[PDB]
Design an enzyme around this catalytic site. Structure first.
Site: not given
Ligand SMILES: Nc1nc2c(ncn2[C@@H]2O[C@H](COP(=O)(O)OP(=O)(O)OP(=O)(O)O)[C@@H](O)[C@H]2O)c(=O)[nH]1
Lengths: 66, 67, 167, 138
Positions: C56-58
């Site tokens: 879920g990292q940017g």
């Protein structure tokens, strides 16, 4: 409309400046807090306040104005 | 996006992000703003936290899809 | 034997929420922030679903498009003890719905208010208010709070999910 | 009501610290740190379960107590019989406020009160208490 708004509050008496307010990591684990040396509501009471999330977690008195 | 632009907290109740010469992403506020900070607050690489001349806080999260 | 897509922001609890759904023996032990993609399976009461654990990292969020097609349901974990990124979660939900695929397919969707244990968390009704669960009217959603360490709350969630994917 | 005992720990849904408070009338209440509305959607059920349980119990108790009221009212006419009285407890506290010069009488009953007489033999001022919700009728 490129700027997604997150929080708008008006009771937070935060009269800091653009130079005595900095955010960084303060307990590791990739959770950045924001530390600010806030003056008094007028400038009489120097108080260091740090912000995590959008609730105040610790404000404590300071000897002189930062 | 490699965007390193200077900000401006004008006294007319607005904040305009300035690159070399162009204006963009100008915002509005219910009151003129005295301090602005842009960084990785919380867990977002694009957080901008701003404090009104009268107090209060306004935190804005920048989307990654920028005769 | 159904393909489901679990969704969640960075450090919102996806790996640990699909991990606690694995059986007793095959359940893993350590949870680490993930990279790229993976494949995972978990058995419900009457069915067995499969998820694609993804970071879920940017800058690692665009990949969410790839798996839009095979999805039959959407699991959406949200850190109910994360008041700041709540609006980011709202915007992610919005930009995931209006995608040409999921805009009309009428698939069931279960939101997971993770970290029900922390004292800095919101109730389900509050997060539902601040997340605008009303702007959707084409899919029957359901939001449930569940701490993903004690394993409580996931059972009823997947139970409603299967009882809605059948009927 | 009046608290009579307090303890910490947990009694319900282990994993969340709570306070157990004994109430005068006996209502052993708890104050938990865990939310109550943990799930929702487009539209809790424990409220419905407790509602149904209280419904059934009040129906059957109404049946029983109505039949017993009939029997008691029809047997009250018995000449030699005597009608006994339900005793009960009134935790009263006739203290003396020091910051003022006014005693602060405090009655408590397990059930709810209907009316309280205050007869006296001394010139006395009955002041008003904001916390009190009763009516007065000098
Ligand atoms: N107290 C508490 N901590 C939790 C809970 N669920 C997860 N955590 C913690 O926070 C993390 C939750 O799982 P995540 O690592 O976010 O799951 P993930 O899929 O790896 O998330 P990403 O790294 O963003 O992909 C774990 O490292 C745990 O330490 C919970 O219910 N309660």
């Amino acid at each position: 409309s490129k700027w997604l708004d997150s929080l708008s509050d008006s009771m937070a008496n935060i009269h800091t400046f653009s130079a005595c307010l900095a955010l960084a990591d303060f307990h590791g684990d990739g959770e950045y807090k924001l530390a600010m040396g806030d003056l008094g509501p007028d400038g009489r009471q120097p108080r260091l306040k740090v912000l995590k999330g959008h609730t105040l977690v610790s404000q404590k008195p300071l000897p002189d104005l930062p | 996006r490699g965007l390193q632009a200077v900000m401006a907290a004008l006294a007319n109740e607005e904040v305009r992000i300035y690159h070399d010469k162009v204006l963009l992403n100008v915002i509005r506020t219910p009151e003129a703003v005295t301090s602005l900070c842009f960084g990785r607050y919380g867990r977002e690489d694009n957080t901008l936290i701003m404090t009104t001349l009268g107090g209060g806080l306004i935190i804005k999260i920048l989307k990654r899809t920028a005769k | 034997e159904v393909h489901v897509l679990c969704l969640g922001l960075d450090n919102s609890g996806k790996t640990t929420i699909i991990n606690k759904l694995k059986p007793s023996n095959a359940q893993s032990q350590d949870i680490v922030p993930t990279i790229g993609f993976s494949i995972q399976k978990f058995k419900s009461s009457s069915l067995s679903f499969t998820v694609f654990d993804m970071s879920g990292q940017g800058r690692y969020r665009n990949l969410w498009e790839h798996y839009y097609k095979e999805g039959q349901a959407i699991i959406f974990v949200i850190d109910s003890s994360d008041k700041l990124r709540m609006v980011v979660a709202k915007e992610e939900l919005r930009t995931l719905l209006n995608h040409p695929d999921i805009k009309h397919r009428r698939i069931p969707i279960l939101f997971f208010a993770n970290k029900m244990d922390l004292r800095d968390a919101l109730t389900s009704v509050k997060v539902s208010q601040l997340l605008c669960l009303e702007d959707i009217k084409d899919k029957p959603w359901h939001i449930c709070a569940s701490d993903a360490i004690k394993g409580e709350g996931l059972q009823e969630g997947v139970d409603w999910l299967q009882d809605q994917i059948q009927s | 009501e009046s608290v009579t005992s307090i303890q910490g720990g947990c009694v319900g849904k282990d994993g969340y610290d709570e306070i157990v408070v004994s109430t005068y009338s006996g209502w052993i209440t708890g104050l938990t740190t865990e939310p109550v509305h943990k799930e929702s959607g487009p539209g809790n059920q424990e409220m419905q379960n407790k509602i149904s349980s209280l419904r059934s119990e009040l129906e059957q108790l109404q049946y029983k107590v109505l039949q017993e009221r009939e029997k008691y009212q029809q047997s009250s006419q018995s000449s030699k019989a005597k009608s006994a009285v339900p005793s009960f407890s009134v935790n009263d506290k006739f203290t003396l406020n020091k910051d003022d010069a006014s005693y602060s009488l405090i009655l408590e009953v397990q059930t709810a009160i209907d009316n309280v007489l205050i007869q006296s033999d001394v010139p006395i001022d009955l002041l008003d208490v904001d916390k009190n919700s009763a009516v007065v009728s000098f």
